[PDB]
Ligand binder design. Structure first.
Ligand SMILES: Nc1ncnc2c1ncn2[C@@H]1O[C@H](COP(=O)(O)OP(=O)(O)OP(=O)(O)O)[C@@H](O)[C@H]1O
Ligand SMILES: Nc1ncnc2c1ncn2[C@@H]1O[C@H](COP(=O)(O)OP(=O)(O)O)[C@@H](O)[C@H]1O
Ligand SMILES: Nc1ncnc2c1ncn2[C@@H]1O[C@H](COP(=O)(O)OP(=O)(O)O)[C@@H](O)[C@H]1O
Ligand SMILES: [Mg+2]
Ligand SMILES: [Mg+2]
Ligand SMILES: [Mg+2]
Ligand SMILES: [Zn+2]
Ligand SMILES: [Zn+2]
Lengths: 669, 49, 403, 328
């Protein structure tokens, strides 16, 4: 009802307490979904079905049905919540009398509270009230067993003082032992006691909401036995709970002014953010027969061009097949990629997109401005204050991807760590007393800049990149992201960038796959299909390898090695996995050969690069519709003409001659 | 030191001091000879593995 | 915690810092870096002083003497007599708060219009409508520096900033303008930086290596009054939404260079220290001044070969202004006349079309606008980028840095 | 179970020799084949129950002494209260505040008369370990969880930091007499009951090795067996086998030792599988460590000695050379 004195005592009094209990029981038993569907019946049904112990009440529904309870809830939330828990337990037992042996207690989580208060606006006015706020979990302790119904051993006569409700305000200190009447020392009987999971989190105002030059305010929140592990550090959440004031914190130690450390007893947490029909449809997508091109076009939808880079990244994402003849000849199944390019070539954007898409993708930088680092250490954590073996960013992606930006600007220890990881897939610590060797089987996608900030094809990739040859060797794909002043490319890239800006202004040839579908496709392809190499032309590949070696030492260039054929095998397995074939087909082998060639050729100097390209154009032209080749030839001819003109101040014959080196109607149209 | 043996250099392709090189009981020089038959056999063996 | 303003420091003194207490409505009315004006009453607060020298005891006036076995001697007697040390601190109790220099007599353009009075609003409107406002602002903001009109224009555009944006996938499009000035000694680089600071609020100064990483970004200190942790703001933080002026930038240490690079790139600062984690937005615009290697800018080299800044730090700068001392008699005469007139007529010789406070108000009002890109504007933008890239083609003389 | 073990030990060793008559306690370490549960699974429900947990050790305190049975004496009447049982685990004990002695009408002994008799105590080893959530078991974006472990009498110095272990113990709390924000929280730990380390020649194996050595072409067998998957290089594989077996280490009468170890260098082109040969040799040698020239990630190539400023101990960080002592 509504009369008498302050809400706290008004609802503490029995009469109103029983009245409100009956009212809430009636509300729970009688409530429609606005369509006649009894929402609470099904809610309790599923709750008891999954043994969840928590019933979520919508505050909007509660206010619409019984406005008195809605008005009283934000004024004396503790008593109202206890009453609601008792009533909900009664109703749940009535529905499922057998459910008493599972939980014997039901937590009523309020939801959709009307007023949302930001952490900076919490004052003494809001003390002992139900409030709704939003924030970012900064830190979160482990799940701690807190005393709930504590039994005590009297260590004078061994009697067991019975259960006392461990409140969240004060320690429960027994009086005398009922048998010996000795107020003497007591102990907690941990076998007879029952504990409730306890977690402490810190939530700070989100940086976006923080305005002007104001600092982000943080608050502590307490999660009790059902809200635990419902959030993780960094998660954006909305928290509803009691603005607690009185547990033990008043600064009575004379350390200063008599202020109270306030905490929030979380009552309801709502985060702000597996393949059955997925697996049904991804098989059809695989049979689509253009899935490889679809994926290659779906990678990095915000990055214009760089089709070769996107193809290499797709192959890396799908990975290869690790193997180990016996237990003595380990060979990695990871396709490592190194994008070496002059500034303004979206290498960072490629790495960030791979971070966004890939699962278990961790972004580290050659500088010291990264959350994680390449080298593993052991120290007491700054926040957790806990002695922790902080393994490196190579180990935090044991079965994932490590995105190493600024790969050319790494310390000596970082370079040694990356060498160890790439060559061994293990990281060895011998630090304090920890002598361990822990596995880091990551796929390394690295970004680097050339010496002098401008790639020069005159020199080779090894002496352009500013990296050690052993470090370079462990990369399957080496993308030379050169930048040139090409009219059409510049115009299209400018169009893309300006359009992105226009559409993202705050006041607001196959179709790419949706990103979530691509993610699930990757999950399935990596988890189930395991391509095998029984059917691959050993004769053809060996002939290619021998010819490549012959051409390598016919000129003064870097020789090809068994490393390259093994990387080609990995990429063939990756393509087979992309197409879910379960067997590498000759087209897969040809595509892997094309990638491996293109990379090895680009690693050479111009003098040998062009020679090898001409000699092995057969392989490089595979899966080329013969229009891209003609377009590139036309582009180089017009570039020669424009560089001639710009300094001094094309015919059909040159194009037809280079084509001969026959059908131009298709290219023209 | 040059990345490849470069038999012409003879001995400049190793920068190890005689003191260090005396320590090792055995020293092997592994030059990637490019006999075509060996190349084909090596490719086939790698694929067989 | 506030500290004395520089305008009141005695010679050779360190500023006095005292803690002031805000109660009730004013509780959050003061923020770090603000030049507030606290009105209230000074008070004393009992202190648990660590002074090893006894002083000013307070005890009971009742004459009581312990009996045998319970003598009033030692800790027992001290407690019985109730002796307590009277050690105090001086603390300020502020009932009201307000900025020392009011700017006007959430945030939006309409909010600023309502906040500012009729006269200030009409002044802002008339200056917005005024023609050649670009040149007027440049001249009124740099009335003593001669030449370097390009640098003045670049700094003005930096002050006005861009429009930050966020893409659908989450990646943010930085809208803040970064400006660096490289040149020969005595070219007014420090003068530009000091003008920017003395004009713009939320503008901070730092030198080559007079600052540490913690003092430049942030620090964490436990709150002695509770279990919480306070974040002591760094230079970038105090300049957040404003300007950080880094003079002698080339001499900044490697660690501080990494910190400033992270701030310029991600526009955020991450602290994992002293039992707490925190990410803080740093929307600062960086105005840097650097000296070429060897002190003089060798015109026969690129900026990469001239200045010692790292490649990422150089890249993250929108504008690079080169001020090479031209040994031209006409320019020297102009500089000499400007300087000598300044030193002769101090109060005079400075006629600014727009008052500094009026420029501040107009800048605050304009910062709310978020202009959009029209289609003809996009076409013009792509054409201009086309021309800029074509300027980088071969044959033509090599440029300082590429496009 | 431990009491029953004591009884059975006495029954099976009843006619013990003179000088060892007193029956000694028995520690029953219990091991299970059941699959372990994640550290994140340790909720309030399992408290006081026998749980099994995987983890990697990151610390191991020194083996201190803890008292299973104490004795106390009265200051005034000098009467003893021998053999007071001490609760196992990190649980304390409150001394009596009264003297048991049957007073003979004299003035009664003082209020707190009891002093521990360190001579008349039975103490046992006790070690405190720190266990960490396995790096793979950690969710992607999540700080690893940590647990504290209590080990007693044979579970001390059974595992060194860095080992991967499964521990079967009694998820418990510290019991020290219920003395900021956390109210009702008592620091938890695991009273380890069983340790298994995640990683001795039989007569049959000795016979097998003896006959294998007796084989005529044992040299060829070993040489091919070392790196069958590596093509060619028969002489190099023979040299690798010679390195693995090693020579004889000799100490001459004058005291000048001669090393039996064999050092082998492989200078070659980057194409060849010399790194792979190194990897196989590292996996194949009894004691073997694979490292680069500049050491590994957070590991040194050679030992480095430092002095701890606080404890003034000599901490010797072991590099590859010292760690692989007696091996490769
Ligand atoms: N191909 C592209 N398509 C669309 N936008 C691009 C492309 N290349 C670069 N950009 C955009 O141009 C700017 C330069 O890209 P980004 O910052 O990733 O450079 P980067 O390759 O990481 O450079 P650096 O190696 O110098 O750090 C960014 O705004 C990026 O979005
Ligand atoms: N172009 C200029 N116009 C007006 N004054 C100048 C100019 N160049 C230098 N000065 C004067 O020289 C003095 C020193 O310049 P300074 O700020 O030290 O330049 P920098 O820091 O680049 O050496 C300034 O106080 C300024 O008045
Ligand atoms: N003779 C060979 N037999 C088997 N595999 C080889 C041979 N030569 C090279 N390889 C393969 O080449 C790959 C790269 O060799 P690697 O271990 O990097 O040698 P290096 O350290 O000299 O570069 C290895 O995975 C290996 O399997
Ligand atoms: Mg980049
Ligand atoms: Mg200067
Ligand atoms: Mg190697
Ligand atoms: Zn009792
Ligand atoms: Zn006694």
């Amino acid at each position: 009802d509504l009369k008498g004195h302050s809400v706290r005592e008004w609802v503490s009094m029995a009469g109103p307490r029983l009245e409100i209990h009956h009212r809430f029981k009636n509300f729970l038993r009688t409530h429609v979904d606005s369509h006649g569907h009894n929402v609470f019946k099904e809610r309790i049904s599923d709750m008891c079905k999954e043994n969840r112990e928590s019933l979520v009440v919508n505050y909007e529904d509660l206010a619409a049905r019984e406005h008195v309870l809605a008005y009283f809830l934000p004024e004396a939330p503790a008593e109202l919540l206890q009453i609601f828990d008792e009533a909900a337990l009664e109703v749940v037992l009535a529905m499922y009398p057998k459910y008493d042996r599972i939980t014997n207690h039901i937590h009523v989580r309020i939801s959709h509270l009307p007023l949302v208060e930001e952490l900076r606006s919490l004052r003494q006015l809001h003390l002992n009230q139900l409030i709704r706020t939003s924030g970012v979990v900064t830190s979160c302790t482990g799940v701690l067993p807190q005393l709930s119904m504590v039994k005590y051993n009297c260590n004078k006569c061994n009697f067991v003082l019975g259960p006392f409700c461990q409140s969240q305000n004060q320690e429960v200190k027994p009086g005398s032992c009922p048998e010996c009447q000795s107020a003497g020392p007591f102990e907690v009987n941990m076998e007879e006691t029952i504990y409730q999971n306890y977690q402490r989190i810190r939530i700070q105002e989100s940086p976006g909401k923080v305005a002007a030059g104001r600092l982000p305010r943080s608050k502590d929140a307490i999660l009790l036995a059902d809200l635990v592990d419902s959030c993780k550090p960094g998660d954006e959440i909305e928290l509803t709970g009691i603005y607690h004031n009185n547990y033990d914190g008043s600064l009575n130690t004379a350390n200063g002014f008599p202020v109270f450390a306030t905490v929030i007893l979380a009552n309801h947490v709502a985060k702000k953010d597996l393949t059955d029909e997925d697996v049904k449809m991804i098989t059809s997508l695989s049979k689509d027969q253009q899935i490889g091109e679809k994926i290659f076009a779906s990678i990095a939808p915000s990055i214009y061009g760089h089709e070769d880079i996107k193809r290499g990244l797709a192959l890396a994402l799908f990975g290869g097949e690790p193997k180990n003849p016996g237990g003595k000849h380990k060979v990695r199944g990871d396709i490592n990629v190194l994008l070496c390019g002059d500034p303004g070539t979206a290498k960072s954007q490629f790495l960030k997109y791979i971070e966004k898409v890939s699962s278990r993708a961790i972004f580290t930088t050659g500088q010291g401005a990264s959350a994680v680092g390449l080298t593993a250490y052991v120290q007491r954590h700054p926040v957790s204050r806990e002695w922790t073996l902080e393994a490196g960013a190579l180990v935090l992606a044991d079965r994932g991807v490590c995105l190493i930006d600024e790969f050319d600007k790494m310390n000596d220890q970082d370079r040694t760590s990356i060498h160890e990881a790439m060559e061994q897939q293990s990281i060895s610590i011998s630090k304090a007393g920890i002598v361990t060797s822990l596995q880091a089987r990551c796929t390394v996608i690295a970004a680097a800049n050339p010496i002098g900030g401008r790639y020069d094809p005159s020199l080779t990739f090894s002496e352009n990149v500013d990296l050690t040859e052993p470090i370079i060797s462990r990369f399957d794909i080496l993308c030379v992201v050169r930048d040139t002043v090409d009219p059409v490319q510049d115009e299209m890239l400018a169009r893309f960038v300006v359009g992105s800006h226009v559409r993202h202004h705050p006041s607001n040839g196959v179709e790419p796959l949706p990103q979530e579908v691509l993610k699930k496709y990757i999950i399935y392809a990596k988890e189930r299909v395991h391509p095998k190499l029984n059917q691959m032309d050993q004769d053809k590949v060996a002939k290619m390898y021998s010819d490549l070696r012959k051409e390598s030492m016919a000129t003064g260039s870097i020789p090809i090695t068994v490393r390259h054929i093994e990387s080609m095998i990995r990429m063939a397995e990756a393509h087979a996995r992309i197409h879910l074939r379960d067997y590498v087909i000759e087209d897969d082998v040809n595509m892997a050969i094309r990638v491996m060639l293109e990379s090895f050729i680009d690693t050479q100097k111009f003098s040998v690069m062009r020679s090898m390209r001409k000699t092995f154009a057969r392989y490089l032209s595979f899966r080329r519709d013969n229009n891209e080749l003609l377009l590139f030839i036309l582009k180089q001819l017009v570039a020669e003409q424009v560089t001639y003109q710009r300094n001094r101040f094309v015919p059909e014959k040159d194009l037809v001659d280079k084509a001969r080196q026959h059908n131009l109607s298709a290219f023209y149209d | 030191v040059f990345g490849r043996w470069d038999e012409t250099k003879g001995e400049d392709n190793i920068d190890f001091m005689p003191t260090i090189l005396s320590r090792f009981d055995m020293i092997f020089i592994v030059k990637d000879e490019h006999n075509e038959e060996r190349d084909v056999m090596l490719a086939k063996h790698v694929i067989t593995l | 915690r506030i500290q004395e303003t520089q305008a009141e420091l005695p010679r050779g003194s360190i500023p006095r810092s005292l803690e002031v207490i805000l109660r009730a409505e004013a509780v959050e009315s003061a923020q770090a870096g603000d030049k507030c004006d606290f009105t209230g009453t000074l008070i004393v607060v009992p202190d648990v002083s660590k002074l090893s020298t006894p002083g000013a005891r307070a005890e009971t006036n009742s004459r009581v003497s312990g009996v045998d076995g319970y003598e009033t001697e030692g800790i027992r007697g001290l407690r019985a007599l109730g002796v307590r040390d009277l050690s105090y601190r001086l603390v300020f109790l502020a009932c009201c708060v307000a900025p020392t220099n009011p700017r006007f007599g959430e945030q939006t353009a309409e909010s600023i219009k309502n906040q500012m009075t009729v006269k200030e609003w009409e002044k802002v409107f008339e200056m917005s409508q005024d023609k050649n406002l670009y040149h007027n602002l440049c001249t009124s903001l740099f009335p003593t520096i001669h030449g370097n009109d390009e640098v003045k224009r670049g700094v003005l555009l930096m002050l006005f900033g861009g429009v930050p944006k966020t893409t659908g996938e989450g990646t943010s499009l930085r809208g803040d303008i970064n400006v660096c000035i490289v040149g020969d000694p005595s070219t007014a680089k420090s003068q530009f930086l000091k003008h920017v600071e003395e004009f713009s609020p939320r503008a901070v100064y730092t030198s080559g290596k007079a600052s540490s990483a913690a003092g430049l970004t942030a620090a964490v200190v436990r709150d002695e009054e509770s279990h919480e942790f306070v974040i002591e703001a760094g230079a970038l933080m105090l300049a957040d939404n404003g300007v950080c002026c880094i003079d002698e930038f080339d001499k900044m240490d490697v660690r501080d260079q990494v910190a400033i690079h992270e701030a310029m790139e991600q526009q955020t600062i991450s602290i994992t220290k002293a039992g707490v984690k925190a990410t803080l937005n740093a929307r600062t615009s960086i105005l840097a001044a650097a000296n070429p290697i060897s002190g003089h800018y060798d015109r026969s080299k690129s900026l990469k070969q001239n200045i010692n800044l790292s490649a990422p730090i150089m890249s993250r700068f929108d504008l690079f202004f080169i001020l090479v001392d031209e040994c031209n008699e006409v320019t020297d005469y102009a500089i000499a006349r400007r300087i000598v007139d300044l030193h002769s007529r101090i109060e005079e010789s400075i006629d600014r079309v727009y008052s500094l406070d009026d420029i501040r108000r107009y800048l605050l009002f304009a910062r709310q606008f978020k202009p959009k890109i029209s289609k003809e504007s996009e076409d013009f933008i792509v054409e201009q980028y086309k021309h800029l890239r074509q300027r980088d083609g071969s044959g033509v003389t090599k440029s300082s840095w590429r496009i | 179970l431990e009491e029953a073990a004591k009884e059975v030990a006495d029954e099976v060793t009843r006619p013990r020799p003179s000088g060892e008559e007193v029956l000694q306690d028995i520690q029953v370490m219990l091991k299970s084949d059941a699959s372990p549960s994640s550290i994140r699974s340790l909720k309030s429900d399992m408290m006081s129950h026998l749980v099994k947990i995987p983890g990697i050790i990151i610390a191991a305190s020194a083996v201190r002494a803890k008292a299973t049975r104490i004795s106390i004496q009265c200051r005034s009447c000098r009467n003893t209260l021998t053999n007071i049982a001490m609760r196992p685990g990190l649980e304390g004990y409150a001394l009596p505040r009264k003297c048991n002695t049957d007073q003979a009408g004299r003035p009664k002994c003082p209020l707190d008369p009891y002093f521990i008799m360190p001579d008349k105590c039975k103490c046992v080893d006790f070690q405190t370990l720190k266990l960490q959530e396995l790096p793979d078991a950690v969710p992607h974006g999540e700080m690893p969880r940590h647990m504290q472990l209590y080990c007693d009498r044979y579970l001390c110095d059974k595992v060194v930091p860095g080992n991967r272990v499964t521990i079967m113990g009694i998820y418990s709390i510290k019991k020290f007499g219920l003395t900021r924000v956390g109210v009702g929280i008592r620091s938890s730990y695991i009273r380890v009951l069983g340790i298994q380390v995640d990683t001795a020649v039989s007569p049959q194996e000795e016979e097998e090795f003896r006959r294998l050595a007796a084989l005529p072409n044992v040299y060829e067998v070993i040489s091919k067996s070392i790196a069958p998957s590596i093509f060619g290089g028969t002489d190099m594989k023979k040299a690798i086998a010679c390195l693995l077996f090693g020579g004889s280490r000799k100490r001459l009468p004058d005291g000048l030792t001669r090393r039996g170890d064999i050092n082998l260098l492989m200078l070659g082109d980057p194409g060849t599988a010399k790194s792979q040969l190194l990897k196989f040799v590292e996996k194949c040698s009894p004691i073997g460590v694979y490292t680069s020239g500049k050491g590994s990630s957070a590991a040194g190539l050679t030992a480095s000695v430092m002095r701890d400023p606080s404890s003034r101990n000599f901490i010797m960080e072991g590099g590859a050379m010292v760690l692989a002592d007696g091996g490769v």
